[PDB]
Amino acid sequence: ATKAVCVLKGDGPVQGIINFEQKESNGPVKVWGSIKGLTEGLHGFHVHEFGDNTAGCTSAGPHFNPLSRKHGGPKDEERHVGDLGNVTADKDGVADVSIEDSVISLSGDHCIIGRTLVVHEKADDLGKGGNEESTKTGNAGSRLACGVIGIAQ
Amino acid sequence: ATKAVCVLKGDGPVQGIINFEQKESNGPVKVWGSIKGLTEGLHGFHVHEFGDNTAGCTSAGPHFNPLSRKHGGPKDEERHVGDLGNVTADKDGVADVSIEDSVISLSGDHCIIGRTLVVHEKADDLGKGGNEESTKTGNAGSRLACGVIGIAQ
Ligand SMILES: [Cu+2]
Ligand SMILES: [Cu+2]
Ligand SMILES: [Zn+2]
Ligand SMILES: [Zn+2]
């Protein structure tokens, strides 16, 4: 039973705790928790390559993309490993997160431990948008909060 | 080849950036950087087991100790994998960190990526303090600052 956790913090009001659980080697990873201080609507939700917060969320670099694919949504064959789609915040500015993903892992070459979880300014268009930036970043804009994914008890 | 980084944060502000570099997976790890906001003198400096900062540095748990050994200094055969001894702060409260260690790793069973680096209130006695706590924590007292160790570019 592998477990991981991530504390999301930024320069503004966005703060979250996100938990990961993977029962089996090469089984699905359950992703859950809560993020507050968000604007109502969709916020892009990604694993970025580097667990580097030296200069804040910008230091995490691009989407975690070990297989050199284009950007997409979690349900797409063509996605980055780190493509976890959107979280949705209500009028209270809270996003309840309950995700299962079979592309991320907590071990092996898809391992996300020691990488950065990022929640974004805008919606991720899941690569289905009307421009080139769709198929690199999903046009989710700035990084509102982030943290390094750590091994949990 | 293998690089890692950690941002230390805590009340003071106690603020640090610590870099890790391991050319070879069978090779030593160079650990360098700077921590400010410390009291002049020795501060214990350890890798703790969990990369969990959900409730602060307390969430990181005990020293990283995959081989079930007693606490020691970095030069000791009998040590926790996480035992990196002390950093030393100047009268300006700055600890310049320059450490080479052959027991921590950035891959394999002694991998410290996704675990928590902690700088402590007091000196680590490197397990030579006599009392029972010396053999467990080095009597280094509270956790002033910590962060999760992430993979770096
Ligand atoms: Cu992202
Ligand atoms: Cu410690
Ligand atoms: Zn992507
Ligand atoms: Zn120890």
Side-chain angles (χ1 to χ4, degrees), chain A residues 9-131:
Chain A
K9 292 200 169 156
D11 297 316
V14 178
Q15 47 201 327
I17 300 193
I18 299 299
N19 299 289
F20 306 77
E21 171 159 59
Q22 192 182 31
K23 285 187 160 183
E24 301 157 49
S25 311
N26 304 294
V29 182
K30 299 210 182 155
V31 185
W32 76 98
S34 177
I35 314 171
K36 68 187 200 181
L38 289 167
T39 57
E40 184 189 27
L42 276 65
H43 296 276
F45 188 63
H46 314 126
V47 182
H48 289 246
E49 185 180 8
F50 312 120
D52 190 340
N53 188 244
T54 298
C57 301
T58 183
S59 304
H63 298 194
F64 175 47
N65 184 23
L67 281 172
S68 305
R69 308 291 264 290
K70 290 185 168 169
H71 183 72
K75 280 183 288 177
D76 296 327
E77 191 173 36
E78 195 70 13
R79 57 170 273 194
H80 303 141
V81 170
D83 287 349
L84 296 181
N86 292 286
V87 297
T88 299
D90 272 355
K91 270 291 192 190
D92 56 4
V94 172
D96 289 337
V97 177
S98 204
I99 284 180
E100 274 180 11
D101 195 78
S102 296
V103 175
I104 63 171
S105 190
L106 304 183
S107 65
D109 70 335
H110 285 15
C111 187
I112 63 172
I113 288 169
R115 306 191 183 273
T116 297
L117 186 67
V118 177
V119 64
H120 283 268
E121 184 193 4
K122 303 166 188 179
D124 183 342
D125 59 31
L126 305 192
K128 311 283 180 322
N131 66 14

Side-chain angles (χ1 to χ4, degrees), chain B residues 111-131:
Chain B
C111 186
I112 61 169
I113 291 169
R115 304 194 189 271
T116 296
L117 189 64
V118 178
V119 61
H120 284 268
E121 179 193 1
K122 301 183 287 167
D124 186 341
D125 60 25
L126 309 188
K128 303 289 191 295
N131 78 177

Side-chain angles (χ1 to χ4, degrees), chain B:
Chain B
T2 315
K3 294 188 203 195
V5 66
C6 184
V7 180
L8 299 168
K9 289 190 139 75
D11 291 2
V14 168
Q15 76 197 167
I17 301 197
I18 298 305
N19 302 285
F20 302 78
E21 175 163 53
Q22 188 184 31
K23 293 173 55 150
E24 315 176 62
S25 75
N26 43 0
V29 185
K30 290 220 197 182
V31 181
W32 75 101
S34 180
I35 311 178
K36 61 163 104 162
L38 294 169
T39 54
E40 170 185 50
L42 273 72
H43 297 274
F45 186 65
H46 314 122
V47 177
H48 287 247
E49 189 189 352
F50 307 119
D52 189 340
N53 296 347
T54 60
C57 302
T58 184
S59 304
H63 294 186
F64 178 47
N65 184 22
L67 285 160
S68 302
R69 302 212 143 190
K70 290 195 173 187
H71 184 72
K75 282 181 188 169
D76 295 326
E77 173 64 9
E78 195 62 22
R79 53 172 275 193
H80 303 141
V81 168
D83 293 340
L84 295 183
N86 294 286
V87 297
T88 298
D90 72 12
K91 216 72 173 190
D92 274 343
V94 178
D96 287 327
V97 181
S98 204
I99 279 177
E100 197 145 13
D101 194 78
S102 288
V103 174
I104 60 166
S105 196
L106 306 182
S107 63
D109 206 35
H110 298 173
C111 186
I112 61 169
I113 291 169
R115 304 194 189 271
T116 296
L117 189 64
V118 178
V119 61
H120 284 268
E121 179 193 1
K122 301 183 287 167
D124 186 341
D125 60 25
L126 309 188
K128 303 289 191 295
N131 78 177
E132 59 175 323
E133 191 78 320
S134 188
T135 71
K136 292 176 175 189
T137 69
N139 293 116
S142 85
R143 304 175 183 196
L144 299 183
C146 60
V148 183
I149 300 169
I151 194 180
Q153 189 184 313

